[PDB]
Amino acid sequence: TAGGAELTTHSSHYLVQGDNSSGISDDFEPKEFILTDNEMEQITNEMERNHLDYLRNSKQVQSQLQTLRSEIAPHKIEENQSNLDILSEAQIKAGENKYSTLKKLKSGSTKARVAFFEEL
Amino acid sequence: LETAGGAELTTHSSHYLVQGDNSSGISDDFEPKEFILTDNEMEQITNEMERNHLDYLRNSKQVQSQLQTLRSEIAPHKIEENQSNLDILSEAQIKAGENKYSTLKKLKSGSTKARVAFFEEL
Amino acid sequence: NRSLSVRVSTFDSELEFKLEPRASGQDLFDLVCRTIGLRESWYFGLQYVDTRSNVSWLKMEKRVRDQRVELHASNNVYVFSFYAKFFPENVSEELIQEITQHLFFLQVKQSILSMDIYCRPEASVLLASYAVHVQYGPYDYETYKDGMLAGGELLPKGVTDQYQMTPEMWEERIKTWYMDHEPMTRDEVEMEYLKIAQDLDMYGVNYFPITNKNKTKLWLGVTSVGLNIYDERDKLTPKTTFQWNEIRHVSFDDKKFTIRLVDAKVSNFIFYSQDLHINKMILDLCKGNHDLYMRRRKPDTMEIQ
Amino acid sequence: SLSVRVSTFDSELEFKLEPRASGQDLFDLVCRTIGLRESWYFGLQYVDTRSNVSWLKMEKRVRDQRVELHASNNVYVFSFYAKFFPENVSEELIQEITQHLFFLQVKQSILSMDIYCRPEASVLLASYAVHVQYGPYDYETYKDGMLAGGELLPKGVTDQYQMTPEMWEERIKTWYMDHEPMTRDEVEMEYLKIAQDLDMYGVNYFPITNKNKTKLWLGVTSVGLNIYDERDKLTPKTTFQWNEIRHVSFDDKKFTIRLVDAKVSNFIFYSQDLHINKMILDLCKGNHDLYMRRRKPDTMEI
Numbered sequence: 001t002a003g004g005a006e007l008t009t010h011s012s013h014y015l016v017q018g019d020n021s022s023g024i025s026d027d028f029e030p031k032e033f034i035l036t037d038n039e040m041e042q043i044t045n046e047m048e049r050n051h052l053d054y055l056r057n058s059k060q061v062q063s064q065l066q067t068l069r070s071e072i073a074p075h076k077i078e079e080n081q082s083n084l085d086i087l088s089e090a091q092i093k094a095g096e097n098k099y100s101t102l103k104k105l106k107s108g109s110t111k112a113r114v115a116f117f118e119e120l
Numbered sequence: 121l122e123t124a125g126g127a128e129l130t131t132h133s134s135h136y137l138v139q140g141d142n143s144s145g146i147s148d149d150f151e152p153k154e155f156i157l158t159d160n161e162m163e164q165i166t167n168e169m170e171r172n173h174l175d176y177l178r179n180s181k182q183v184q185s186q187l188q189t190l191r192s193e194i195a196p197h198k199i200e201e202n203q204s205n206l207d208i209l210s211e212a213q214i215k216a217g218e219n220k221y222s223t224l225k226k227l228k229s230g231s232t233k234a235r236v237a238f239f240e241e242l
Numbered sequence: 243n244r245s246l247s248v249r250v251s252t253f254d255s256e257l258e259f260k261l262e263p264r265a266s267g268q269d270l271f272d273l274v275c276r277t278i279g280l281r282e283s284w285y286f287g288l289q290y291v292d293t294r295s296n297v298s299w300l301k302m303e304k305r306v307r308d309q310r311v312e313l314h315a316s317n318n319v320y321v322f323s324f325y326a327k328f329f330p331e332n333v334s335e336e337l338i339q340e341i342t343q344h345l346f347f348l349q350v351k352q353s354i355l356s357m358d359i360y361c362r363p364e365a366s367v368l369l370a371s372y373a374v375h376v377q378y379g380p381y382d383y384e385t386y387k388d389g390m391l392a393g394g395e396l397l398p399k400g401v402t403d404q405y406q407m408t409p410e411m412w413e414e415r416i417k418t419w420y421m422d423h424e425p426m427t428r429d430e431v432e433m434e435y436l437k438i439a440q441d442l443d444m445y446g447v448n449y450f451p452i453t454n455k456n457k458t459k460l461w462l463g464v465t466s467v468g469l470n471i472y473d474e475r476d477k478l479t480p481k482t483t484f485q486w487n488e489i490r491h492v493s494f495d496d497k498k499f500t501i502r503l504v505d506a507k508v509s510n511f512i513f514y515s516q517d518l519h520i521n522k523m524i525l526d527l528c529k530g531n532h533d534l535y536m537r538r539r540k541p542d543t544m545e546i547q
Numbered sequence: 548s549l550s551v552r553v554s555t556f557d558s559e560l561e562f563k564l565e566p567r568a569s570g571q572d573l574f575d576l577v578c579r580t581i582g583l584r585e586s587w588y589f590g591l592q593y594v595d596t597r598s599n600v601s602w603l604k605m606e607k608r609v610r611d612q613r614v615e616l617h618a619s620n621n622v623y624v625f626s627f628y629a630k631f632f633p634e635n636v637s638e639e640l641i642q643e644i645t646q647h648l649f650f651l652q653v654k655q656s657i658l659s660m661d662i663y664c665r666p667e668a669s670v671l672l673a674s675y676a677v678h679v680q681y682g683p684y685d686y687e688t689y690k691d692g693m694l695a696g697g698e699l700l701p702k703g704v705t706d707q708y709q710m711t712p713e714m715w716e717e718r719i720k721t722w723y724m725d726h727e728p729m730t731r732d733e734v735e736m737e738y739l740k741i742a743q744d745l746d747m748y749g750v751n752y753f754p755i756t757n758k759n760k761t762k763l764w765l766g767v768t769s770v771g772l773n774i775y776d777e778r779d780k781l782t783p784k785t786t787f788q789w790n791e792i793r794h795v796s797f798d799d800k801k802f803t804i805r806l807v808d809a810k811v812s813n814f815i816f817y818s819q820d821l822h823i824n825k826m827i828l829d830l831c832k833g834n835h836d837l838y839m840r841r842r843k844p845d846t847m848e849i
Binding site (some may be wrong): 030 | 571574586587604605606634635637638663665666667668670671703706707708709710718722740744745746757758759761763770774776778779780781782783784785786787788790791806808810811812814829832833836837839840842843845846847848
Binding site for chain 3 (some may be wrong): 202219
């Protein structure tokens with residue numbers, strides 16, 4: 001009528017074994033736990049959405065921020081701008097933010113990133 | 121010379137892999153569907169479960185003595201030839217000082233090999 | 243290819259639906275849960291008598307039409323009972339919704355009143371005084387009516403048969419305890435009733451008659467926490483027990499159950515159970531209870547909307 | 548018998564300690580006195596007898612940790628600071644006290660230009676800072692002197708515009724009036740929510756060099772290890788997340804980082820201060836602990 005059999009059991013996970021010898025010293029529990037790869041990825045998806053939710057709920061403030069920036073732009077003393085000021089203006093011109101940049105960099109392989117590190 | 125040094129030696133892991141994708145049975149789609157419970161987590165949960173129960177005994181110490189009062193207040197009206205075998209077993213368990221959870225903890229305090237052996241002798 | 247007339251009985255009401263001809267068990271189950279607002283659906287199931295005089299639970303992914311529901315003694319209506327099939331390990335930490343608490347309160351109380359599970363006389367009076375508080379609210383001298391009660395409906399018959407006392411003598415002791423309750427809400431008193439019910443020896447034990455290899459008659463008790471073994475004549479206290487997390491595999495072939503333990507060093511143990519249908523029910527009860535045993539210990543799996 | 552002053556961003560503590568007192572004893576006294584339970588972010592910073600900035604260690608005695616006493620009249624002086632930063636303040640900071648200590652430390656980090664902030668954003672931030680100090684805008688109470696101090700905006704912002712101080716003040720006040728139905732700690736969190744998105748927020752910067760003797764910045768963060776070009780501190784050139792890193796060690800000036808992927812080569816960088824090299828080690832170990840603990844939330848309860 002019916003039949004089954006369980007075949008491959010495979011696990012991919014992070015083992016965390018804490019110790020109160022040095023560093024952060026509080027006695028938290030659980031002191032030892034395991035997080036599967038997918039628990040980690042699900043937490044990462046959830047964090048991206050929390051941030052994209054915050055960007056969505058602040059749309060009025062971000063709009064205001066660019067209004068103010070335009071309104072005072074006539075008074076700018078470019079000769080008093082800094083290194084970082086110019087970098088920041090380039091970043092905005094190119095549509096970049098802190099998180100999309102980091103997400104883009106991490107999408108490359110760890111092998112690629114170590115080698116990229118090495119020809120700098 | 122060096123003031124200090126250290127080295128990590130054995131890494132050992134003892135844990136439960138819960139792959140909970142049912143074809144039959146409980147059907148609801150919960151998350152996470154796969155998770156791992158470490159041995160010490162399991163025992164940590166046993167300890168906080170036993171502690172929750174003992175907290176409940178303390179918080180109900182007044183009701184337990186009310187029950188004992190009532191038991192002996194109605195005791196003179198007992199019709200012994202009308203007691204069931206459960207009643208006899210229950211009173212004996214009361215006399216001996218035994219309760220559901222204490223009994224289970226002592227039974228489990230012996231190895232599974234002992235208990236399998238005990239079972240096959242029954 | 244005609245529609246299905248269905249009636250479902252929770253412990254609180256009768257629900258009547260018409261389903262598509264090929265509706266599935268999951269369809270009925272979701273329909274019931276949505277109707278009553280139940281999100282902690284994992285404890286519950288749809289029970290029925292089949293075309294073999296066997297009490298069964300509805301399967302979720304078969305068609306309702308295909309599960310041998312008996313139909314002639316019922317005027318062609320599919321008749322189900324909605325019951326808790328599984329019980330939490332601690333009600334006050336695990337039962338989240340009020341509909342869930344209420345449905346457990348009503349089913350457990352009928353277990354006790356009908357003596358499906360044993361209860362001591364003095365505990366039955368306490369339970370009775372809570373039941374009264376649940377039905378009528380906190381004791382109010384103004385609204386109380388001497389004769390608002392009846393000990394023959396509030397106490398297990400095995401209690402009242404055990405004592406040389408009149409119904410009115412029992413009622414007065416129930417009333418006296420009822421008067422003394424801290425004025426809780428009705429749903430709070432339901433939870434207090436469950437907190438006492440859940441400590442009874444027979445609470446949440448599914449009993450089945452078995453024989454070990456010596457042909458000793460015993461009781462298998464499948465619980466939320468594991469497998470209990472009882473002597474034929476002592477259902478109160480188990481002789482030995484095996485916790486769900488010690489058990490690796492459970493199976494039967496014909497009358498013979500084989501149970502393998504996690505510890506590879508310990509040998510399997512065997513017992514016999516004489517009805518194959520009962521054996522499938524033992525297998526389902528073990529798998530379900532084991533599922534919740536692990537899920538209970540990973541509380542995110544028990545979240546509700 | 549040990550005389551101690553601890554300064555948080557909010558308050559000061561003067562008390563005595565037994566000569567047997569450990570760092571843990573001092574840390575606990577400070578935390579319990581201010582009512583802080585989210586202690587894992589915080590540390591006790593001091594100057595040692597080598598004029599190195601250090602963090603108090605927990606299970607050595609206070610008097611065995613080389614605290615500089617001479618320039619202080621024999622008082623042990625410490626700053627209670629956040630050493631580690633949450634990844635998302637909204638989800639992670641539980642207590643008002645914790646939030647307030649982060650608000651003050653981050654705001655001073657922006658006003659002093661320890662972390663870059665854009666002009667129009669500093670005006671948003673300043674409009675919240677005003678709300679924190681004075682409560683919701685109220686025409687009844689508002690006086691121009693509330694904004695008239697020159698301490699609301701970073702100097703780098705006002706220096707790069709030809710505007711009067713009052714043009715700045717009016718552009719702060721306009722926003723201050725605009726978002727008024729808010730409690731104090733609600734606007735502190737709004738501040739933090741803005742600040743945590745700044746590119747330099749939460750980055751511990753250290754000067755390093757790679758194999759090729761290229762000058763780079765190592766950025767230790769709550770999420771991993773950022774690598775910056777020597778002249779761009781906003782945008783990392785590459786990065787490595789905490790769960791990708793298996794082991795961090797230094798010998799002399801040489802850091803060796805090993806990755807979880809066994810197929811990938813270790814990589815090296817050089818950092819010239821030995822004392823900095825131990826602080827880099829400590830920030831790595833501490834941020835990595837919290838990275839995993841964050842993802843097992845029960846470890847973060849109080």
